[PDB]
Structure 1
């Protein structure tokens, strides 16, 4: 179908087995399954298989693929990579992340991340976001639920390109003219008003992500309904400082939430400030 530059990452159906009995994720476009993939060197690796079987339209799947295929060119330790796609239900094959999504890991009681672990997680997210911003890539849905944690405690910024989906319906509003799915309590103030997204709106969401990490997965603005959120933000009210968040780190989040998008720090400035907080104390 049309251009075949996707043939560079096509995986043969005989090189992949999808364990349909083991669901590790559920998006709106399809579920995520455990998978077994044979490398080009003949090695068996764990992998996750995201299906897009809920979007059934020759034109709409083609636009999603060509819009998402850019992730094959991205390569950064804190950015989720594309192992390939299996054309058979256009399957997206992704590396398996042992600890799942970042928010579920830190919410789990039986896990004992330290205050320094949580700060380091946010520094990894900042490093991955700095890379994507360098490639002029806007990640309109940055949140703790949308980052992954692999075997070596390496955080991967996910939910973009062919991996983009709504994996937690609770926090999204579906605009009823455009198709846009809006994470209301993670969007910048100007995004709530105009529904356009920039790298500076990503910085706002990163501050909410940082706040999520320091509360170990608490939902932001639990007493502010999704209508009153825009006025709440217009009065200058912001998410309060978590109990175990260092003062210099809370000041970083406050910088991310400035009414003016040009006032907020770049992700490169965020990496510097967080790494300084990470090396001290």
Structure 2
């Protein structure tokens, strides 16, 4: 039982010679050699069983990735677990190993426009597939985008993913959210549960902006501060934008704010490709109903060199409890790999 950073990984004997990669709230990721396929891989140790929420997230993630098969989406090579429900304390997800992630990359490397264009294309390509499956990733960020030496990109971390539920998206002002603050759409703070595809598009716009400058565009220090940052660049929402906000506390808060002017994209990104700024504007639209859709984004002039509808596949089969019972469902989903 090899140990990484005081954490025991029961992945032997197929997987030997382990190296640490990253640490999650209820899971850890390492690299390891695969003696059966003769290559290093990534292994995710998930220990969710002590909490129901963590158990919910694990089941959904496993279910989705086991259904999904796409070049721009991390798949599951294998799942390791104890032979019995009683002896199962942790679940191990084996995945292809990627050299790095976008978060790591942006910290020290300036991206060329060619790189920005290709990365963005691959994100949207993957996202087209996800959304075609009626699924929402709900946690897109640079750290969840893996890269390799040839600039191939794969979306990872489907823990907060859900089936789209447009008709059950409304909620009140300042309703608590789980996904990464800096990438939350303005509507989350005002009237949305984040059950619509537009939520993912906002996140992609934020990533694009971050690719352009190597700095997060809306770095909120707390819940409402996030909305402030967004308004600080987008400016005051139009009357039209406001008519879609019918819950009064959210509507009256916006109306209470002093008029703010829109900061021009070209002032924020003086070196940016103009077509890139045009698409950025469309992704970062305050009104989620006016926000560009994934397929629309792919057909945008900025991505003309890579756009090919025939080569941007969609899902063949879209998606239509106490902690203990969830453990049982996790057990069953993983039985195939025993």
Q: Same fold (TM over 0.5)?
A: yes
Tell me the residue number matched to 1:97.
98
Bigger radius of gyration: 2
Question: Any unmatched runs of 5+ in structure 1?
Answer: 1-10, 165-176
After superposing the two structures, state which structure 1 stretch, 204-213 or 266-275, moved more.
Answer: 266-275
For the structure 1 residues 60 and 218, does the alpha-carbon distance in structure 2 shift closer, same or farther, using more than 3 Å as the test? closer
Equivalent residue number for residue 246 of structure 1 = 273
- CA offset at residue 37 of structure 1? 2.2
**For each residue in 1:47-87, what CA deviation from the matched residue of structure 2 results, as whole angstroms up to 9, or x when unmatched?**
1111113x333866653443122211211111111112110
Q: In the superposition, relative to structure 1, how do residues 239 and 87 fare at CA in structure 2: closer, same or farther (>3 Å)?
A: farther
Unaligned runs of 5+ in 2: 1-9, 83-89, 163-174, 238-261, 308-338
Give 1:210's aligned residue.
208
* 75 and 239 in structure 1: CA distance in 2 versus 1, 3 angstrom threshold: farther
Aligned pairs, number: 246
Q: Pick from 262, 269, 282: which aligns with 1:255?
A: 282
Q: 2: CA distance between counterparts of 1:60 and 1:181? A: 11
The verdict on how the C-alpha distance between 1:65 and 1:182 changes in structure 2, with shifts beyond 3 A counting, is closer
CA RMSD in angstroms comes to: 3.0
Contact 1:102/1:155, CA 8 A, preserved across alignment: no
For residues 8-38 of structure 1, what are the alpha-carbon distances to aligned partners after superposition, in whole Å with 9 as ceiling and x for unaligned?
A: xxx984322361xx22111111221111224
Task: Flag the 1:13–1:194 CA change in 2: closer, same or farther, 3 A.
Answer: farther
- SS in structure 2 of the partner of residue 104 of structure 1: helix
Choose from 32, 36, 39 the match for 1:35: 32
Tell me the residue number matched to 1:220: 217
Cα distance in 2 for partners of 1:84, 1:61 equals: 20
Alpha-carbon distance in 2 for matches of 1:264, 1:242: 21
**Structural mapping, 1:18-29, within 5 Å:** 19=18, 22-29=19-26
- How many angstroms apart in 2 are the aligned matches of 1:79 and 1:93? 14
CA distance in 1, matches of 2:98, 2:145: 10
* Aligned mates of 1:155, 1:95 — CA distance in 2: 12
The verdict on how the C-alpha distance between 1:277 and 1:184 changes in structure 2, with shifts beyond 3 A counting, is farther
TM-score by length of 2: 0.65
TM-score of the two chains, using structure 1 as the length reference: 0.77
